[PDB]
Amino acid sequence: QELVSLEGHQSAITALAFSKNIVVSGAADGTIKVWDILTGQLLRDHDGHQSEVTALQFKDNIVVSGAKDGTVKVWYIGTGQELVSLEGHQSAITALAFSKNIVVSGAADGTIKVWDILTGQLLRDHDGHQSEVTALQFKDNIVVSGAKDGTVKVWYIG
Amino acid sequence: QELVSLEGHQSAITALAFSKNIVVSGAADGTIKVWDILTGQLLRDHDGHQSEVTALQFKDNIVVSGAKDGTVKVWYIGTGQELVSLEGHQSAITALAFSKNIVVSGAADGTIKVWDILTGQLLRDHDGHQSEVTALQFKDNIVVSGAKDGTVKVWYI
Numbered sequence: 021q022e023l024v025s026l027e028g029h030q031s032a033i034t035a036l037a038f039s040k041n042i043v044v045s046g047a048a049d050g051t052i053k054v055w056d057i058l059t060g061q062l063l064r065d066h067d068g069h070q071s072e073v074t075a076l077q078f079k080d081n082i083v084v085s086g087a088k089d090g091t092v093k094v095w096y097i098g099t100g101q102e103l104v105s106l107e108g109h110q111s112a113i114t115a116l117a118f119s120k121n122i123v124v125s126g127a128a129d130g131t132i133k134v135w136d137i138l139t140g141q142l143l144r145d146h147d148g149h150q151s152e153v154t155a156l157q158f159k160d161n162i163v164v165s166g167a168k169d170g171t172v173k174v175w176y177i178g
Numbered sequence: 179q180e181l182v183s184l185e186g187h188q189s190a191i192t193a194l195a196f197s198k199n200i201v202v203s204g205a206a207d208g209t210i211k212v213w214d215i216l217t218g219q220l221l222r223d224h225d226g227h228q229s230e231v232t233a234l235q236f237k238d239n240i241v242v243s244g245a246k247d248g249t250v251k252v253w254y255i256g257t258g259q260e261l262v263s264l265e266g267h268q269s270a271i272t273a274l275a276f277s278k279n280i281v282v283s284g285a286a287d288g289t290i291k292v293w294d295i296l297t298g299q300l301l302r303d304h305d306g307h308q309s310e311v312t313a314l315q316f317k318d319n320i321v322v323s324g325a326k327d328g329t330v331k332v333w334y335i
Binding site: 021024026028031032035036037039043045047057144154156157159162164165166167173175176178 | 179180181182184186187188189190191192193194195196201203205211213215218302304312313314315317320322323324325326327328329330331332333334335
């Protein structure tokens with residue numbers, strides 16, 4: 021049944037993203053791999069993160085990846101090169117959402133940050149839930165987030 | 179900027195889904211709540227699962243929810259009533275993917291199951307991975323799965 025053969029990682033798969041004919045996979049050792057789904061070949065080994073990558077988003081040749089060390093990176097699928105620099109969080113990334121040119125990230129300390137992928141500038145910043153963000157949904161300038169304390173919050177982004 | 183205020187759940191949020199102006203939330207106690215983004219009111223308390231809900235998919239008025247007891251449920255957003263029956267998995271649901279009228283579910287035993295939401299029929303039933311399925315991507319009849327042993331597989335369906 022297997023369409024192609026992928027080598028996988030030397031550690032647990034923690035994040036997955038799929039756009040056009042390219043698969044991006046992240047693992048608990050910080051590694052990120054880019055695969056061609058038409059041939060099964062490994063396109064490139066990304067620089068990865070210094071920590072387990074916890075979230076991936078992949079849209080229009082642009083990948084956003086987050087790690088347990090709080091880093092959020094925005095890079096070009098074709099080269100793995102960083103397009104822009106984000107400050108990230110001082111806590112592990114627990115949720116990522118990517119819609120239009122906006123990245124929303126959630127962290128274990130409850131903070132939620134809104135980034136512009138064009139410039140990397142922090143558009144919106146707050147402490148959010150003050151409880152680990154467990155789920156993020158971002159659609160049509162509306163962010164819906166959930167936390168470990170049971171709260172569900174809705175933010176308009178504009 | 180903060181649109182509405184939602185009561186939330188009495189336990190930790192484990193899954194979120196958002197379609198049109200409706201939010202579906204699932205919690206560690208098995209409860210599933212349906213919210214109206216506009217008014218901010220609680221639309222209904224779904225029957226939920228007898229286990230912690232681990233995954234949520236919400237698309238075209240149809241919600242697919244999975245739980246740690248291995249149950250996958252397909253129900254209508256407006257009423258909460260189950261439309262069809264899925265026999266589910268024998269271990270915990272760990273990943274859900276919903277594209278067109280197909281649901282792909284991955285479990286802690288590594289099994290990957292493919293369901294038709296119109297009939298509830300099990301379309302495909304792979305052994306999948308030798309470890310827990312940790313990620314699923316489903317697009318254009320192509321399934322990409324990842325597992326805790328580091329494997330990544332691509333399935334045509």
